[PDB]
């Protein structure tokens, strides 16, 4: 609903990866400082600079 590039990235952010957890839930993992997280980093965003 409401197709727009307001808050959409697609294949996760840069340096990140979608890995499947032992429970089945796909968590996020960054490759910049080797640090994963349960929450969604690509979702927590609503502002930028241009």
């Amino acid at each position: 609903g409401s197709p727009v590039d307001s808050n959409d990235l697609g294949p996760l952010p840069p340096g990140w990866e979608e890995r499947t957890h032992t429970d089945g839930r796909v968590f996020f993992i960054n490759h910049n400082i080797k640090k994963t997280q349960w929450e969604d980093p690509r979702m927590q965003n609503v502002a930028i600079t241009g």
Binding site: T22, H31, T36, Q37, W38
Partner: peptide, 17 residues
């Protein structure tokens, strides 16, 4: 006897992956 669904610690570290 699990019960606890979310312990608190993040997923598997990249170093361990």
């Amino acid at each position: 006897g699990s019960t606890l669904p979310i312990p608190g610690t993040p997923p598997p570290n990249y170093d361990s992956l």
